[PDB]
Ligand binder design. Structure first.
Ligand SMILES: [Mg+2]
Ligand SMILES: [Mg+2]
Ligand SMILES: [Mg+2]
Ligand SMILES: [Mg+2]
Ligand SMILES: [Mg+2]
Ligand SMILES: [Mg+2]
Ligand SMILES: [Mg+2]
Lengths: 222, 226, 204, 211, 195, 196, 233, 195, 196
């Protein structure tokens, strides 16, 4: 029997800073125990200072990103070149996803950018389009390896002030983009060690008021 | 897993990668897959790791007793025959896929054995999820009358093809060379092409970070005198 | 229905400088229902420590079995069993049930009383030994523990730093697992003192 | 776990914050009260998307109703728009168990339980989710019509806490709402970790748990 | 069968067990006592598959009575509960396992302490201040978690139990026909005869 | 697999391809499917490799013990031992075996033991997945009392065609000649037989 | 939903300094029966593109007609059909990928794996894969079926990353490709000795080679292999 | 839902319908009214699949109310029951059938007679002195077969009904939370408010 | 079923057995499997009898209408119409058809359309359950540009063997010869071909 779905591996990670956001993904594409490509980009600049990744089944992921980019184009045509704000992009993607509620896009979608006050924003979607604004979200193969680490090192979960023995929480300081990128690289370095589908390369898209920048790092190729 | 065996001039070489996995998770990054059946009979195992270890130990034990009984050095064909008859009886339920190599008074040998109990003979063999990658290298570079150095080279190249191309394989190359009239040389982590780069940050915590409800000393000592 | 995640729970072990640590959560449940918050999963036979995750009936059975066997070992050998030796015994014992196994993920930690060397090992339910230089994980949040340990761990931590590292690895792994938590214990083990600490953690 | 109940001061809505995939805790920051409009609340149980999507769609239908009729939609009418819609889809695999909550002049404080197999039930106390049985116990034994707003809010919070403690698939944090005739009022997000210890101490409950 | 609850208070253990026996379509009986006295200060309640429940319970009872006669001595509640656990753990890998869950309430005369053990058909044993099997815990534990104190008297234990049973009678779909309540303390085992 | 055995004037010849597959992967391209159970009693194996190796090892043992006690066994006796194992364990075996041997009284003989453990004495026999494609060719071209060279040609051309059409057959063509004169092993490579 | 009936095995390909190479054998199998022995599975489109196809042959023949009809149509009302408005490899690929994904989305796939190899107007190498699920990806080497498991490891030793491409001559790349085809012939039970190979070079255009054979085969060592363990004769 | 009974006495029809609504594990409600007034002298009770019961009942009610307004006339109970039967008979060969069973109790003002119709989800219609759906008949019909008289008063009908409900509460495993009882006679429809 | 078509010097010949079975019962022992879709375009049918008859009737209709409008269709055109029906309705058909025809420009041509609706132009083609047994024989014995008598012999010997080994093939061997000279029907009875 024909199975219309597949699994192309991949792990993605979005983190919202105070006045920036990053969306990162490994560049390895797999089926079963084979590598299809060591560099197949999976995080995309969609215009209007929005970056997107739809991780999971790559055919559905590519179709969704392509449809969203198109929706940005038509939003400009239909609404006097108005900039598509991140909250509006998020609601729009919910409708793209829920339109296939009974034959879903088999992907976990994350978008990142800045909200209308210039603050960092990340939105996370399930395959049929429930979504929420979040500070921190890993998706895909190694998500379960990465999130607990982020809970501990971004949100300081289970850390208390020395001397108070559990009476005073470690206070939640704001991280710079350099700091966030360190946590992203260590997240993926660790995931690469323990997850067979994670490796080859790491591509990070960084969004600020100045636009979208890229960074690339090698990961282990075994 | 990627495992290979390669015959050469005066002996036989086996090699393996060092990754063991549970589904997509790497349980152990420096697994030892080259097992000793006897001093000069070694085997490499793919499939259910408990089974490859257990079946190797059991036949190794019985081979040692056989050796003492007969006052003779163990033969590879004996290990082979005992392995295959044990595996056959269990009808594939013992998930051991092995490459068995060794030297004995009769010469040098290389066999493969499949979980249901079939065996094969050859000058070069590969097993495991990485075996198609390994076999591509062996079919490209193997020739008759390899030297020791050439066979070690070929065997580890073949494992490397598995390491880089098979998600089921990774980390390091282990090699064992069995040459006629010599001690078997086991070369653990013969190649080490996958050391983790230094992390960006140290994650050592300040002392007192963790909240504690209770402390106590645990008595690990036996009941005391007096 | 999957026997290894009916009751829930986790164990982690780590090596440091002339020490080892082994820790576990305290939950026992029946699927979604939390049943006990005092179900310790770490046991010891002399100076050798054994953590066991998985089906709780088998956790209890295996503890009783290894107490049985290490007691007889001691009477006959006239010395306490060592971590390396005990590891082989666990593996032998599990493999003897190859085709009707105990649904467990055991973890051994201890220091060899003669060499002073820190030792840890893990097993699948059928006795395959994973002997790690760094850390061993087991249970329903083992993916989470691999993630925590792989980034938090560094070699040669002093006992008091190892305590923080292993505690934070456990706590944050458990908080991303529905079936783990409800309390936690950490053993810090040196050649002639062992300290046991109960951690404060969220109770949901 | 999600609950809603009617009392002299309106409606209390209380929910936990946890979403799981199998044993994996996907999120502890899920928003399970969907703000349909400033006067109407719905609760999320079953499918997260089905609840989000169709209850914000409900908000759109409610807005159109009041544009056309120049009057606030009743909770009766609003809840029935949702139940009639999901009933059309019956058999296709929608998953939803929700309380539609409002307080109008004609009706007073009103709650309808609406469900993806087409059920629509008016009632005073509902509790839905994997932890519902734990929440009901606390609710049933402490509920009165004449609770003050303050005690009603606490009771809703305490009931979700009970569920979060015992149910493996409930927890994270408690979200509270009070629905009045003039609109709902948000009463904050309460981390269960901190709330549990605080309640144990101040109340002397959970003696089974060492703190 | 259906509901079995237990609570260990200051000086006693109280077991409450439903009275209904239902063969599919009809309630065949409404006065069934789902309990066996194992020794003068140890009581075991049980629920699970028809036939196996009573067979298992009487088998355990016969064994503990045998031990009592052989040694002229009453095993501790802990010892009895360990014996019962081993029997269920052995049974779960049998050809046909006993599908039986039990609570063991005993008063330990040596320590002068009530003890409550919960054991399911797999041989999963836990000692608890209060416990249950089946769905009973889902409706009652939030109440017990709230009101339980380790220094409660027997009468406060019974009142907390009444509240638990009232919640069960409210929210549970099945009519379990009330409960039989028994108290285990330093003087032995007695039945509260109006509940 | 493509295997056959053919009686001729001076005895009998066995032939086989050398391919064994796991699905579409060629696990071994130089297999020896011609297996010796006694000096001048050989067999070609098809079906489960585990089963046919187990069976042949047991038969070899039986005929070794038979020889120790009663002298050289006949080819018929060897076929009977094979059959006994295949027939009695038919529920648990997938084995199709051709038995070929030379006696001085009986000369060349061929027995085929198909799946159910029946036995059939034949002038020649073909089996394996590849044999389906050469039933017509073999039936048209087989003659009794061929010379050694003719029989080698017949087998070589036959297995040529089986290999051509059957994806599960391939590699080298191996043969074993059994006559009064001894035991001769032959091998033919692709560049020879593909051009036939 | 169907099932493939007559099928073609691996297609393999790689980039080199001035272009791309692609190869595929000439067999159409019918299960394990090697039924058809002169099947061309590399289909050139114009002078800048070669589309290599594995999987179901009836669907391959359909796709081949789609491509031919694409060329006809592109020429309509197009004075620059043989110049600036010729079909690019990238147009041909995107079209095929669109069709493949639409067909999977209707639960009626074209049961193939496809590699489009060519050179763009600006001289850039093009190499990209698409299959019956609509999954697409690019890499310096690409292979379908068995080729993915056995050819890629070998081809990746020549071009392991993007920076290796300019160091790889057409002679080194072709020899690598030809060796991979020999290896597949050794180890793939549904392969044939006969294959086609196409080079698309930015300087020398499209070279299409038919009736190639696997040669330099090692079989001699087989004479020494006896029994399966203990047999000596 | 679960129990629905009806009995037609001398001058009225009495419908008794359980109050429980159970979503699997919890009794969500214990005051549910499983009935719709179709016209001033016609009442319909219903049970079956969740959602479909109330949807079907309100659909029938809307249709009969439409007819009443169009013609300024109340259809006879026989006519209403035939309309309902046709709707269920059409529904059973639908893409997704209404899984709903009903009793229709009406007082025919032209004949001055109470009438009770029993209709299952297949469109199987029968007129009866008393009837039920589900398992209710299995526990109650032996009592009704014994005591029923066609000349009973309304109060004797209610007493016989009390006895039926008592037998249900005794032998039925599920707690249906009592019944709501409604009487249909020459003056219309009213609810007995203590039962 | 055993069917084949063979091009030769003067055109093309089609051959078939005449057995159609329902399980092991021979429902018809004198079937005509050589079906005319145009004067000098014929086909042999294998697979579902219902399907192949439906398909051939539709093709005949198409080529009749083609002829009315555009003159005599080529054999390729006929193959294309067959293919269109077999390919587009592949989910609902079990049909394996060989198309054979004579043009004066193109002379004898043979196309085979197997199960999935692919098309393959060949010098000769074999199909049906019986064809498995004569792949080796046909490959060894086919030559291009045989005479009429040689081609009749080749087909007769080929189908002889297919019938011998295949239980689903049997009866008479029917042939149809397509040349410039016309359309000739041949029939060969068991007592002839069984002795070959
Ligand atoms: Mg990795
Ligand atoms: Mg077998
Ligand atoms: Mg947890
Ligand atoms: Mg919880
Ligand atoms: Mg929990
Ligand atoms: Mg239990
Ligand atoms: Mg072949």
């Amino acid at each position: 029997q024909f199975n219309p779905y597949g699994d192309n591996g991949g792990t993605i990670l979005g983190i919202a800073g105070e006045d920036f956001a990053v969306l990162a993904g490994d560049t390895r594409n797999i089926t079963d125990y084979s590598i299809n490509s060591r560099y197949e980009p999976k995080v995309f600049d969609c215009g209007d200072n929005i970056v997107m990744s739809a991780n999971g089944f790559a055919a559905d992921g590519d179709a969704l990103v392509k449809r969203f980019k198109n929706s940005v184009k038509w939003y400009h045509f239909d609404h006097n070149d108005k900039k598509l704000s991140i909250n509006s992009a998020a609601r729009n993607i919910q409708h793209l996803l829920y339109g296939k509620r009974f034959f879903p896009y088999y992907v976990h979608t994350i978008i990142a950018g800045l909200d209308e006050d210039g603050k960092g924003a990340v939105y996370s979607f399930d395959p049929v389009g429930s979504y929420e604004r979040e500070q921190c979200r890993a998706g895909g193969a190694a998500a379960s390896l990465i999130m607990p680490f982020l809970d501990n090192q971004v949100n300081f979960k289970n850390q208390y002030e020395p001397g108070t023995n559990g009476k005073v929480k470690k206070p939640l300081k704001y991280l710079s983009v350099e700091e966030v990128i360190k946590l992203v690289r260590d997240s993926f370095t660790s995931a690469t060690e323990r997850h067979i589908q994670v490796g080859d390369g790491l591509e990070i898209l960084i969004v600020t008021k100045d636009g979208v920048r890229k960074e690339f790092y090698e990961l282990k190729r075994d | 897993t990627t495992i290979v065996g390669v015959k050469f001039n005066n002996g036989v070489v086996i090699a393996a990668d060092t990754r063991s996995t549970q589904g997509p998770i790497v349980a152990d990054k420096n697994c030892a897959k080259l097992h000793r059946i006897s001093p000069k009979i070694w085997c490499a195992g793919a499939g259910t790791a408990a089974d490859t270890e257990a079946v190797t130990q059991l036949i190794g034990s019985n081979i040692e007793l056989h050796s003492l009984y007969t006052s003779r050095e163990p033969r590879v064909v004996s290990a082979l025959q005992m392995l295959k008859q044990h595996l056959f009886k269990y009808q594939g339920h013992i998930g051991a896929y092995l490459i068995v190599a060794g030297v004995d008074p009769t010469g040098s040998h290389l066999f493969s054995i499949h979980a249901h109990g079939s065996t094969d003979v050859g000058y070069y063999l590969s097993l495991g999820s990485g075996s198609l990658a390994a076999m591509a290298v062996l079919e490209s570079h193997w020739k008759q009358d390899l030297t020791k150095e050439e066979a070690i080279k070929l065997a580890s190249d073949a494992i490397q093809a598995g390491i880089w191309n098979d998600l089921g394989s990774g980390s390091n190359v282990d090699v064992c060379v069995m040459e006629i009239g010599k001690d078997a040389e086991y070369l653990r982590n013969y190649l080490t092409p996958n050391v983790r780069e230094e992390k960006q940050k140290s994650y050592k915590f300040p002392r007192g970070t963790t909240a504690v409800l209770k402390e106590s000393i645990v008595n690990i000592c036996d009941i005391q005198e007096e | 229905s999957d026997p290894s995640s009916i009751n829930g729970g986790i164990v982690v072990a780590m090596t440091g400088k002339d020490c080892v640590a082994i820790a576990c959560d305290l939950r026992l449940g029946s699927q979604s229902l939390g049943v006990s918050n005092k179900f310790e999963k770490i046991f010891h036979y002399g100076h050798v420590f054994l953590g066991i995750t998985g089906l709780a009936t088998d956790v209890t059975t295996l503890n009783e079995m290894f107490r049985y066997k290490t007691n007889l070992y001691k009477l006959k050998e006239e010395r306490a069993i060592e971590p390396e030796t005990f590891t082989q015994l666990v593996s032998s014992s599990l493999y003897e049930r190859r085709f009707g196994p105990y649904f467990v993920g055991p973890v051994v930690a201890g220091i060899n009383s003669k060499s002073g060397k820190p030792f840890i090992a893990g097993f699948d339910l059928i006795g395959c030994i994973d002997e790690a230089k760094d850390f061993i994980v087991s249970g329903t949040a083992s993916d989470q523990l691999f993630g925590m340990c792989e980034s938090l761990y560094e070699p040669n931590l002093e006992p008091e730093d190892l305590f923080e590292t292993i505690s934070q690895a456990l706590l944050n792994a458990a908080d991303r697992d529905a079936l783990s938590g409800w309390g936690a214990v950490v053993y810090i083990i040196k050649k002639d003192e062992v300290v046991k600490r109960y951690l404060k953690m969220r109770q949901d | 776990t999600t609950l809603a109940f009617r009392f002299q001061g309106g409606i209390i809505v209380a929910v936990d914050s946890r979403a799981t995939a199998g044993n994996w805790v996907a999120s502890q920051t899920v928003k399970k009260v969907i703000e349909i409009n400033p006067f109407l609340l719905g609760t999320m149980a079953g499918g997260a998307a089905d609840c989000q999507f169709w209850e914000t769609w409900l908000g759109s239908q409610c807005r159109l109703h009041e544009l056309r009729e120049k009057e606030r939609i009743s909770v009766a009418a609003a809840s029935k728009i949702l139940s009639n819609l999901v009933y059309q889809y019956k058999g296709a695999g929608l998953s939803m168990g929700t309380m539609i909550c409002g307080y109008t002049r004609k009706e007073g404080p009103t709650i309808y339980y609406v469900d993806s197999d087409g059920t629509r039930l008016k009632g005073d106390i509902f509790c839905v989710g994997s932890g519902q049985t734990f929440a009901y116990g606390v609710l049933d034994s402490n509920y009165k019509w004449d609770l003050s707003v303050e005690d009603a809010l606490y009771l809703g919070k305490r009931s979700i806490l009970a569920a979060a403690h015992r149910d493996a698939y409930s927890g994270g944090s408690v979200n509270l709402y009070h629905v009045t005739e003039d609109g709902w009022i948000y009463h904050g997000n309460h981390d269960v970790g901190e709330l549990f210890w605080k309640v144990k101490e101040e109340e002397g409950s959970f003696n089974n748990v060492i703190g | 069968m259906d509901i079995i609850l237990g609570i260990r208070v200051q000086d006693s253990v109280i077991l409450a067990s439903s009275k209904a026996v239902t063969r599919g379509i009809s309630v065949l009986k409404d006065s069934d006592d789902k309990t066996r006295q194992l020794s003068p200060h140890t009581l075991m309640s049980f629920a699970g598959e028809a036939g196996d429940t009573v067979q298992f319970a009487e088998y355990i009872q016969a064994n503990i009575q045998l031990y009592s006669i052989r040694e002229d001595y009453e095993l501790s509640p802990q010892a009895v509960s360990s014996f019962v656990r081993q029997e269920l753990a052995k049974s779960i890998r049998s050809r046909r396992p006993y599908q039986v869950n039990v609570l063991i309430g005993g008063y330990d005369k040596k320590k002068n302490k009530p003890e409550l053990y919960q054991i399911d058909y797999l041989g999963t044993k836990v000692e608890l201040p209060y416990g249950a099997h089946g769905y009973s815990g889902f409706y009652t534990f939030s109440l017990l978690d709230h009101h339980y104190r380790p220094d409660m008297t027997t009468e406060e234990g019974l009142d907390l139990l009444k509240l638990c049973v009232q919640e069960l009678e409210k929210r549970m779909p099945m009519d379990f026909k009330g409960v039989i309540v028994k108290i285990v303390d330093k003087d032995g085992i007695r039945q509260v005869d109006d509940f | 697999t493509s295997i056959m055995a053919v009686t001729f004037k001076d005895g009998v010849i066995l032939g086989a391809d050398s391919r064994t597959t796991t699905g579409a992967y060629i696990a071994n391209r130089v297999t020896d499917k011609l297996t010796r159970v006694h000096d001048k009693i050989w067999c070609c194996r098809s079906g489960s490799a585990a089963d046919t190796q187990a069976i042949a090892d047991i038969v070899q043992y039986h005929l070794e013990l038979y020889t120790s006690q009663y002298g050289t066994p006949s080819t018929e006796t060897a076929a009977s031992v094979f059959k006994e194992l295949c027939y009695e364990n038919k529920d648990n075996l997938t084995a199709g075996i051709i038995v070929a041997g030379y006696d001085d009284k009986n000369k060349g003989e061929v027995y085929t033991i198909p799946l159910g453990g029946s036995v059939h004495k034949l002038p020649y026999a073909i089996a394996g997945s590849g044999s389906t494609f050469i039933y017509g060719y073999c039936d048209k071209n087989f003659r009794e009392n061929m010379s050694k060279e003719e029989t080698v040609d017949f087998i070589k051309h036959s297995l040529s065609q089986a290999i051509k059409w059957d994806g599960s057959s391939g590699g080298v063509i191996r043969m074993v000649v059994l006559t009064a004169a001894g035991v001769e092993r032959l091998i033919f490579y692709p560049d020879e037989y593909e051009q036939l | 939903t169907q099932q493939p009936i007559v099928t073609g095995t691996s297609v393999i390909s790689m980039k080199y300094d001035n272009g791309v190479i692609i190869a595929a054998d000439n067999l159409g199998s019918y299960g394990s029966l090697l039924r058809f022995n002169g099947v061309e599975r590399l289909i050139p489109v114009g002078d800048n593109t070669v589309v290599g196809i594995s999987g179901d042959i009836s669907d391959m023949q359909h796709i081949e007609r789609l491509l031919k009809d694409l060329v006809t149509e592109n020429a309509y009302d197009n004075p620059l059909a043989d110049a600036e408005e010729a079909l690019e490899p990238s147009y041909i690929f995107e079209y095929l990928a669109t069709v493949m994904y639409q067909r999977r989305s209707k639960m009626n796939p074209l049961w193939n794996a496809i590699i489009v190899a060519g050179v763009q107007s600006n001289g850039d190498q093009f190499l990209r894969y698409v299959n019956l699920l609509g999954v697409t990806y690019s890499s310096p080497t690409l292979a379908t079926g068995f080729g993915a498991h056995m050819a890629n490891p070998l081809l990746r030793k020549v071009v392991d990353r993007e920076s290796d491409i300019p160091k790889t001559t057409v002679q080194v790349a072709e020899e690598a490709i030809v060796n991979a085809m020999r290896v597949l012939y050794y180890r793939d039970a549904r392969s044939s000795r006969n294959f086609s190979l196409a080079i698309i070079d930015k300087n020398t255009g499209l070279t299409f080679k038919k009736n190639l054979q696997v040669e330099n085969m090692k079989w001699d060592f087989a004479k020494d292999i006896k029994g399966y363990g203990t047999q000596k004769i």
